[PDB]
Each structure stands twice: as structure tokens, then as C-alpha cells.
Design a protein around this ligand. Sequence first.
Ligand SMILES: [Zn+2]
Length: 202
Amino acid sequence: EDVYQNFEELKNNEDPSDYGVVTKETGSPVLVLAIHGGGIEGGTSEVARELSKEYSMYLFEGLKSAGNSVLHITSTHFDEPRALKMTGNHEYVISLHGYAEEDQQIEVGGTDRVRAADLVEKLQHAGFPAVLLNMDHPHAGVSPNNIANKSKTGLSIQIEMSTGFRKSLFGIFSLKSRAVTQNERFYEFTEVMFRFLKNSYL
Ligand SMILES: [Zn+2]
């Protein structure tokens, strides 16, 4: 269970300084979506911001010193108005998430089954620990209600990164310091992502 059922409820309950909505609109067909940034799923803000160097981005970030889990709205309920706008304005969506696991692992899902498999292959070739989840796996990112699918095509890739994998990319794993301690692994990973994104969405 999430604390809030939708964005309006979160907005009416939380101080606006405790969260932030951040957008970058470039007209790229692909949108990078991170609805659980900041302290909600740590590291997803930094990955999103780096990818926004070449692609449009939507970021919702939890900015509390503690307790950011209360700001998590599951994807099938996430309706913040700028997210609805940006998703509908784009052809395709890549949606970044974190989950709790100490081992390094990347779980890839979504509605775009061909591109999801291709991403997994490209990550595995590059030495990253990715697996493809199929249609019946729980939380596969396939619901029409999932924000990531509310695009012009309906085709998404869901990237779920374990705690271990996310912590491997930063010198200091904090709200304050991830953004200024990205390591060589961070850039290696984001580069694999930039190569995939440019080749897969011509
Ligand atoms: Zn998430």
C-alpha cells in the first residue's frame, strides 16, 4: 500500500518543499521517466538527469530528510499533471525504478517486448547484470493504467535496478551527494544506455 492514491492527495498532504517535479522537453521521440526519484528510489534521479543530456525527461523526486517512502505513488496510480502531459507528448517511454535487493541486478520489463529483450542483451554483453521479465511476471509494467504506457504508441521499457546495483554507481549514496560523486561505473552504464537508445529508436 502507498500512502496516497493519486497526486492530488499527495499535494494536499505534503509541504511542497518536500518533493519536486522536474521536466526537460526536447521533442525527442523517447521520454525518460523517473516517478520515484530523490530519496524514494535513490539513484533514479541521477540516472534520469544524465540521460536528459540527450532525451526528454520527467522526474518526480522525494526531497525529505527522511520518510520519502510516503511519497511513492505506484505507476498505475501516478497522475501528476505534468507527467500526463509529457507522456502523451512522446512516442516511447523508458521508466526508471529501484527495488530492494543487495545483490547487483537489473530487471527489465515493459510493453515493448522487442526493445526490452534487445536492451537486456546489450546490458549482458556489456557485463551488466540484467534479466528480462516476461508478461506474467508481477509488476511487469504492462497495465494501460501505468503512467509509462500513456504515450502515443503505448510502448515502454521498465528498468528496475536493485539497491546493490544503484549503490555501485556513486561514491556517496545520499540525497545530497549522489549527484556529485558519480563514478566510472555510472558513466559506463549510462553510456551503454545512450548507445542503446540512439540505435533502437531511429
Ligand atoms: Zn518505482
